[PDB]
Amino acid sequence: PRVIEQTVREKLPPGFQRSEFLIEKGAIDMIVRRPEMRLKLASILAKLMNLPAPNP
Amino acid sequence: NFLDFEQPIAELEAKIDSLTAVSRQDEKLDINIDEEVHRLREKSVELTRKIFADLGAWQIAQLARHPQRPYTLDYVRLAFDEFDELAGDRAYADDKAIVGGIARLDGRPVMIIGHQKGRETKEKIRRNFGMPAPEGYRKALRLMQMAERFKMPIITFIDTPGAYPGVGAEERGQSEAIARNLREMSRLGVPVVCTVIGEGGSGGALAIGVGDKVNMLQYSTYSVISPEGCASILWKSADKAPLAAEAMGIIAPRLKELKLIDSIIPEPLGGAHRNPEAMAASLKAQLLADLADLDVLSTEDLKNRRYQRLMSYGYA
């Protein structure tokens, strides 16, 4: 952000380059918090690999 | 919030709902609620049956856009499970008018893509009343490619008034994005099943609707142009829209008899808004039955069959 600040010599948009902002701008798929991360990754990998879902 | 022709049913429902509250409202009133509620419900059911015995293409359009009706999110919640929403077009933004994601159905993961309108006015504003910007179509292309990669079935929904005719949509290659969608979806190696929940059409909705199977609801319309637009163009008047709707044949039986779809999904009496759960059950059963037989086909033979059905399009 400092490089962009010195380049455009202006103010960055509020919440610049934040996951909330970058999922608005479509470059980010989903926002997942760390405690849920293990189960979410297991579920997504099981579905994509077409494997049976993990038992929780 | 009801339509014009729903006044006999509307009046009685302002009295049935109160009786539950009147059971303990005030003054120690716990009247013989049960029998009166049952009689009023019988009367309301008979009136609804009599009213919806008479149906019209305009009435069909009104029910298709009744401002209370299951959208894609409702059908996903009440017919699917384990839905993980994927967003982002990778290019410019994530337009809310298209909702896509990956979910499991009877142990088989599926890709669900469909438009979403919104219940409250604020949600309708936020979702642009279901009008997809081109970036949404690019997102749908990306999701379809991802589903194609990992041998995954694709089931999509079509509930949108029309592709958004905005400044930004035209500035950002609207036609280009729709064409790019329509080219790749004819090369997918997995079955594609689509439903016409709500009101859908206008050609733009076809970017997620070229597949082996097509199904329609009982009170849904699928037209090349909007009936109001068709009236304002051809009849030189907006108020002749019901006449244009009658002439076109946007109603479900007309589009069924034209051999353009597979079958009409029935609705609960009173339309889908009266019992959305029964509608969801019917939709789940129909989609499961449709997905059952299609999965037998191999990818090469599936693409060849799709191409032959693609050639089957048109009268000539």
Add this chain to the structure above:
Amino acid sequence: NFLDFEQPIAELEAKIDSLTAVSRQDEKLDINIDEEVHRLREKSVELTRKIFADLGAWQIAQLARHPQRPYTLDYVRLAFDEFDELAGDRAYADDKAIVGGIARLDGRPVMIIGHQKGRETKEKIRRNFGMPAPEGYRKALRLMQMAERFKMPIITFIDTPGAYPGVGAEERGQSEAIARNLREMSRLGVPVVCTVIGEGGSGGALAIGVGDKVNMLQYSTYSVISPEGCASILWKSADKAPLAAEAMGIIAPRLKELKLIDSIIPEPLGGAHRNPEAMAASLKAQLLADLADLDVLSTEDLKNRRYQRLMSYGYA
């Protein structure tokens, strides 16, 4: 418009050019122009040889960004022919900082992609001083795919200060676009040859520079970060930029001896701006020689060799 250390040559050229006009300037002066012009040219050549005998990494950087130097358009005009410019990214815009197109070379059509800076200040503003927005990189991806489709060779140029660090570039998936470029270009079935004309680097320029061959000019720099940025980061001061340039080894011999490139293309004495035609001839000969041997390889073996050379990257 000359640099700081070019003052002895600059003064004499303000007198050589006039003598052509003085041949018929006024007052019936048609002096013995020929011998004086030849003597002044001899003196200027000797001074230029003495000045450029002593060379420095900063001087290397200054010559790499001398505000008179052949860009991609100049090399295309003076070394290629039948150039048809293709524009459009299909997505949002056609950023001017990248110029791409299809041209014929010795009867063999080629795909030419490279950055362009601009001579006048207005052109430099219009082209963003050669800083590519992500849509330009998407355009380059599309052109490379098109060249891959019709069994066409690809030759690209790298003359850019760095990927544009703007608000719009970051908003529109700069890193995503560069990654998408860098993934596909490792799957092309045709040879990829790149040159480091002008000043190029900053990593972003590598999105069109991962191929079987890499070549550099004699007075060109190819660094991971800009020398001024490297100074301002590591040395905590901008004015120590020449020290950072000396330490890094951005000069052509340093990057040649590190086994990162194939060969250094020599320049006409006085640098490329003095005789751009001879520089174009040298570049044409080098690219023709490089393209000659590479075309023998078959597409599968070519991709395998590229993958093995891809593994050859890095010290470990």
Add this chain to the structure above:
Amino acid sequence: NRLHSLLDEGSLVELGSELEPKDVLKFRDSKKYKDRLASAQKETGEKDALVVMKGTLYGMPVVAAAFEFAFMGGSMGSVVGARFVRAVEQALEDNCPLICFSASGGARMQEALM
């Protein structure tokens, strides 16, 4: 710690652990690159930014990797890329998804173009 949190205990298998920073450029910054290399190596207790561990997730084999940001901004060295390629090779020869968690301040300048 991230690998431990994700991968199941009793299955952690580090891959490509023999690779270590083998500087070849001899960069001359304000400080010698060896100074920062040694400082980071002795502080983080790890050879490079990337850490590789083939594990198992809920009965499904999986490969994992993560960047230690404290290693000079988690910059990608040649060891990092080679270890990533090793994980990819393990996934290809032993069919399993690969996961990498990104944390890096940028490319390692002192390794230059490499």
